[PDB]
Protein: glutathione s-transferase A1
Organism: Homo sapiens
Amino acid sequence: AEKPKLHYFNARGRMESTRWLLAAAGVEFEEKFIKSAEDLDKLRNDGYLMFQQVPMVEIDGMKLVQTRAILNYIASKYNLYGKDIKERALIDMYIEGIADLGEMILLLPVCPPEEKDAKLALIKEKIKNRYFPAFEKVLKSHGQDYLVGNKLSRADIHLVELLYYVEELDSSLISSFPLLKALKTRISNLPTVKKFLQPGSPRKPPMDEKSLEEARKIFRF
Amino acid sequence: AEKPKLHYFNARGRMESTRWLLAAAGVEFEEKFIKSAEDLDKLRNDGYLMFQQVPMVEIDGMKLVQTRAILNYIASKYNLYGKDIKERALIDMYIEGIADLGEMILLLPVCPPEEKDAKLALIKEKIKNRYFPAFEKVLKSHGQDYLVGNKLSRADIHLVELLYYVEELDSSLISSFPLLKALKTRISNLPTVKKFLQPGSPRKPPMDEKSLEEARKIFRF
Ligand SMILES: CCCCCCSC[C@H](NC(=O)CC[C@H]([NH3+])C(=O)O)C(=O)NCC(=O)O
Ligand SMILES: CCCCCCSC[C@H](NC(=O)CC[C@H]([NH3+])C(=O)O)C(=O)NCC(=O)O
């Protein structure tokens, strides 16, 4: 009997794209925050984590690990995964490009300090020259307010989340991509997303060094 | 209309799981091998690669990039992705664990020499203590010949592929996992997989140093 229950630490990390997708879908959720290695070990010892890792989400009577398993379930359940197999292929292709870029941004702070400047420069180059051109071209191709099927899907949600992180890195990177700018505004004004973006929501801030320190202690790295 | 066409270099890399899945499904396909940077640049210049990367597969009148988009499409098309949303969530959880382990093995040879021994040691620990226990537990929980739904799915195929790679790493690692051993035998005896395992199929050999140098020249890393 439950709202979905999100098991993670109090940070974006690997859970934030799930927070975004549930919120976009209008689904209220609860979070159980891991604060210590001891908390993680309890989840493990109680049999809740198939591969001894989080994210884990309790939803519809079961316990799901692996970010993509969680996301795929939520997207299908709430009709955000397209209408057929071909639309799912477009969605998947798009969101896996988003994932590749998002992964780079997620792990930047765990890069060795002597590698960070080059890694950041590489991310900016890929945004400007690979990823933003590819999504701009999709929107330019059909002229529709959404990426796939002329209707909101998880692709729109995952992309606009990523546009917010790119803005935190360098607000100028989107400047030559007017359709991406317009998508960002449109998605951000949908009632459910607007509510998620407002202060006090479950949306999480950029990870600071204190949070990274907590991650290292919880996940033992 | 036409057979799927697989665009990659002549190696396992990120295309081999697609070769296994198609073969297991009984689907004949064609390969177009990239042999140099110039071949890759032609695919790029011709507009065929959304993110300027391969794998790319031409299937059912469309070009798909991103390994998971390709695999998801093929699995759905050939009824290897479960029967409903809950079975897909089990499949996705399982295969993303498999992916995590597979990725560690795939990238081992591009780890700096100074760190390879320690990375290999940690991969073997995770196999023995994390991943093989998790899959053995699944098979023991229901006593069924397949991981999900008592019928062949992509999870069985992706797992057994990985079991072949683990065998190449260290043939002792599976020894305390009799149900995984049994699964490897049963799946290997399915007519389509048996054929794929025999000589002269599209199955690719382990990547040797000369093939890794070719990857470096093609992909410019
Ligand atoms: C820079 C931010 C990093 C913050 C921590 C990373 S997420 C926590 C980590 N989980 C994973 O790595 C899960 C990977 C998995 N592929 C998924 O996406 O769910 C964990 O439980 N690690 C414990 C373990 O593997 O033992
Ligand atoms: C031991 C080395 C392993 C060799 C595997 C390299 S795969 C080739 C590489 N493609 C990718 O990285 C694709 C990643 C994508 N997430 C997917 O899974 O399809 C590429 O085109 N790279 C060119 C580029 O990104 O510019």
In short: The pocket of S-hexylglutathione (ligand 1) is lined by residues A 13-14, 52-55, 66-67, 106-107, 109-110, 215, 219; B 96, 100 (CB under 6 Å).
